[PDB]
Nucleic acid binder design. Sequence first.
RNA 1: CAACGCGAAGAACCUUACCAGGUCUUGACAUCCUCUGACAAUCCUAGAGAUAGGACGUCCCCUUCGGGGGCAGAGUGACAGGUGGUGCAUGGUUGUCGUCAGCUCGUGUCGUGAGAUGUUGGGUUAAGUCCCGCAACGAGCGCAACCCUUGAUCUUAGUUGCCAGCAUUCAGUUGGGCACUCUAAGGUGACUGCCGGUGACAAACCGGAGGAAGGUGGGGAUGACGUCAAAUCAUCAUGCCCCUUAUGACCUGGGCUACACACGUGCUACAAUGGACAGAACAAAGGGCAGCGAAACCGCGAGGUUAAGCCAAUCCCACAAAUCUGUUCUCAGUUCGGAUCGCAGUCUGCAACUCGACUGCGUGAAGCUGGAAUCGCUAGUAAUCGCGGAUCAGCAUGCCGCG
Lengths: 78, 139, 95, 60, 149, 125, 206
Amino acid sequence: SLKKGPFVDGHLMTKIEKLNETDKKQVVKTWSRRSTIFPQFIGHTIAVYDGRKHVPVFISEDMVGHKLGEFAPTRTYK
Amino acid sequence: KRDFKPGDEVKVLTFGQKGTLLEKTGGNEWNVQIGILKMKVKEKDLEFIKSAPKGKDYHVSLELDLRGERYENALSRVEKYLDDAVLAGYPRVSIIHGKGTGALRKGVQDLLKNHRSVKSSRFGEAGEGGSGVTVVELK
Amino acid sequence: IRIRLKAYDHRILDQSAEKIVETAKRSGASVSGPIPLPTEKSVYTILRAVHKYKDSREQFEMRTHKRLIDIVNPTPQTVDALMRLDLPSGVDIEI
Amino acid sequence: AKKSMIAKQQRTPKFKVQEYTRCERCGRPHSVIRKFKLCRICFRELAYKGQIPGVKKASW
Amino acid sequence: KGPVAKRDVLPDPIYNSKLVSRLINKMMIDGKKGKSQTILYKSFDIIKERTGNDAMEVFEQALKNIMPVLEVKARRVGGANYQVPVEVRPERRTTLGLRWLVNYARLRGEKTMEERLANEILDAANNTGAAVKKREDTHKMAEANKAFA
Amino acid sequence: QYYGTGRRKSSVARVRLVPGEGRIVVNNREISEHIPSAALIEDIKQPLTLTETAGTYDVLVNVHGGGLSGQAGAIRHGIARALLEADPEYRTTLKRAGLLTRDARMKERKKYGLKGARRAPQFSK
Amino acid sequence: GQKVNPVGLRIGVIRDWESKWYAGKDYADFLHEDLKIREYISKRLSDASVSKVEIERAANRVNITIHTAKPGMVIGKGGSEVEALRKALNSLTGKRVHINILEIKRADLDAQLVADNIARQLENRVSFRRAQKQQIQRTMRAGAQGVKTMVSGRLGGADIARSEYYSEGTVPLHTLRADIDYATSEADTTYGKLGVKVWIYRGEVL
RNA sequence: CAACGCGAAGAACCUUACCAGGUCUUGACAUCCUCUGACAAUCCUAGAGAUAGGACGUCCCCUUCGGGGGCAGAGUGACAGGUGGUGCAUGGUUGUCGUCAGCUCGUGUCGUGAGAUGUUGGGUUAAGUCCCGCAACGAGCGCAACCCUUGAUCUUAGUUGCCAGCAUUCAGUUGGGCACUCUAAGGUGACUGCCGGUGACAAACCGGAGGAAGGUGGGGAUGACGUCAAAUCAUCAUGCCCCUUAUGACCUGGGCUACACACGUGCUACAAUGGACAGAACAAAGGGCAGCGAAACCGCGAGGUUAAGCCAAUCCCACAAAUCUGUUCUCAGUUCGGAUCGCAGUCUGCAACUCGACUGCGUGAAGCUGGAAUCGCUAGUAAUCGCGGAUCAGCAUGCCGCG
């Protein structure tokens, strides 16, 4: 939460913009649940590590400002 | 100006004496050893000189007499006596002993054989007086 | 000129500072008296046991004393005399 | 597993945050003192033994 | 163990009328100095207006009407828990009377503290206070259990 | 022109007093706004009322430290020792009421294993 | 638990820090430097017995004195080993060092040497009774005012550890006017670890 | 009791050991062996490790210049590494009874022996403190004192402190000066010392005079023999066990912060001895150089900007709060209480989602003094009021200390 821009790790960026540049289709892997979502990754799918398993999730239009860690619940319950 | 370094020999105008450079604390401030003093000296104040490039109270005797006293009392002070002889650098020494019980007379000689400084201990010659002396020499 | 000296034990500061004062007064110089500056303490606090009982503790500090001396006239003709002297490493000398 | 991590302590990590402090005399990561870079038990040992040239036992 | 007693907060020694004594010192068992003394003075005044006569006079008349002479203490002898009454020492008397004065002063429940203590001064000068009530309560219960000794 | 020293509780008062009319002041400022409560404006006049030097003298005090009763006691003990150095013939009368006894009522050292100075933490089986 | 260390209690009032110098803003690395230099002399000169070492930092050039009497052979023909060890010290400390050796008279009543001794014949497998008993009588023959010696661990009975002591004379630890000198040494044997502690009372300090 | 705001005096990664995944095997690392001999660094490509290639890239010092030394790389085999258990193998540590006055010994008597006497009796004390008795006579660890601090004063030294008589300022600010405060060294002082009385006159006890202080002035430190097979194999180490194709390393992410409930320790409230708003004040003790960061300006505010000074009795942290004076609220789930949420931001850090703190907003919870019970506290104490420090990128209601 700071006005010098939201914070991501660069390598996953480079692959995902070349991905949406040439061929939008298939899924992208990550171990980093830390990157802030940018509003130009609408429609894709990301396999995010929860600490134990890679989980796919779909990014919609309203998915702005969050991080990808909001959707891989690390801990379960009843 | 000069590219001054730590360890450089240098003089301060405000005090006029030769001293040694240590470190640069500011943009133009250094720490200077001037003799025993340690003044923080501004860079306009320095003038270059040059850059970076026992115990004796004792005398030790040559002999010792060890007659009429205890085993484990003596070996503490014959180890001390051998150390004193090294400090004076004697190549040869002797420890006169007793006759009757004779336990320390055979007892000391085994200690010098395994002692780290002595190579040998030997009995006296007929020209010295025979068994009136037993001699020790060191490494 | 000013001089500042400080160390942990006033039993070294007393005769070192008095020796400096007497050396200055015997030499050709004008020198006032040593003002004893306030001692400060850095109190440390540490647990006794290795694992438990934090209701057990001991207190340690770092008593360091400072005395302050000025020379009234600058006296370059005797700065060499008060320079040649030496004090043990226990006390630091500052101008 | 104690001694791999102190090697991790002297050799530098990739970010300025990761330099967690340690005492190298005895390798406790907790409760070191910045003034001596030394933690509690191995501080107290040499403190009673005589070093740290100005420490005395407090009483007031 | 060993009985001890001590002076506290007494006023200036000479010409100590009780009005100047509690004007400069005394009572003050409400908390800290400040918002304990100011309020007491205000209570003391709002009764000069109510009855145009001496405030300290009606104050010690109220204290007198609060003054007990009997107080009971319990005993463990017997499996029926008897209670025995004893004569109250004067220091205990004054501190205990002042204690009940202040506690139903704060308990009596009016809109503010000064009129609360003022009405308590009036209702202890006359015999219609809760403290007067409990005074006669312990008096009559001590008279009831006075047979034991 | 007469001098006394006053220490009560982390608060030392240096008082010099001159004959006058009873003008009471500290740090060239009036007491009545500096100490507002009459229970501490009695402190100044209490010794000079238990003796008779009430209206013939006025006081000038320099003061540092502590809180309001903190220099109030300091004022008291300062004017006390001042009147002892003035006329010590009533030293006995002033000593009978005391006020020369340096009171040992200073704050206590906070000690470990405790909260405050004596309060143990709450304890249960 | 236990007592406090007498000499740790007496530091600064009767005792010296043996590190008399002052550092500020270089206190830390200076301090750990005194630790490793002490380690170096401790495991190098363990043969000739050392008790305590005082470090001076005059003009940041380190200065050392070393105690005890058996290094009379270190002082002697071993001026070569004195020079070699000092060269290693300047190899370790950057800025160079100067060392001195101080002889100790009555080395029998110095706690470090006593504890090292008891650890030595405990490694050499004399009975702990014999070791403690001859040492204590040797000290109070030397002139010590009162000596108590400690031992703890698996004293032959490996199945249960215990502790043993003997003491006579007077050993007033509670009096701070007393001069006490404390050692601990750790005797290692095939049985595991055997602990040695010893302290010497040598009259009061006026 | 003597575990439970405890190790941990600070978990976003690290710490971290645990889990998922991806990895390596003389290895994270140490001593040696044999060669290259000085060496790795640094930036681009996929890329978390790490690999792949280039770029200064494997380049020092002494060298009667033969060769040695340092300081790494490569390879190898002995080995290394274990927070892999065992406090019931242990050393070293610590609590507890308990700051309780007890605990013992030498020598001698008596019993036969277990043992006793000393250490019991009379009196006294905080005390096995002391006195008088007494087959005991002595001694030691104990207790007290000796140490530190706080209380009263003398001398020394007056600056970065002080301002008294002075003269001048916005302010001791200056010009002056150590007077006073203070600083901190050296000292002086309190010891039943003295008097009177009680007590055998003994030890003491009681009351006075003095005295700043009076009966160990207060507080601190200081923990006997031992007990709990108390705890600590997380500082250390025979002992077994772990392997080097893993209980050893590396890396990323997660977890140590979960949640139907219970217990403890704290904080904050339930209100008019109050709340809000304005004004007026009055402390001590500490910290500050990869640090404190002034004033001023910007921003409502968290904070932002250029930045003065200070290695500090100068400068900075740093405007103490409670308190007092006045105005208002008018007894209610409230101008109480702020919980939890939504929105917008601030700082730090690669990074604030799990999982930080803070600000401006809006919303406003339960709660109107708490059962059976139960705790702390003998005066600067309790109770309240703030203020520092450590740990430290950022984080404290906890701890330590200050008034």
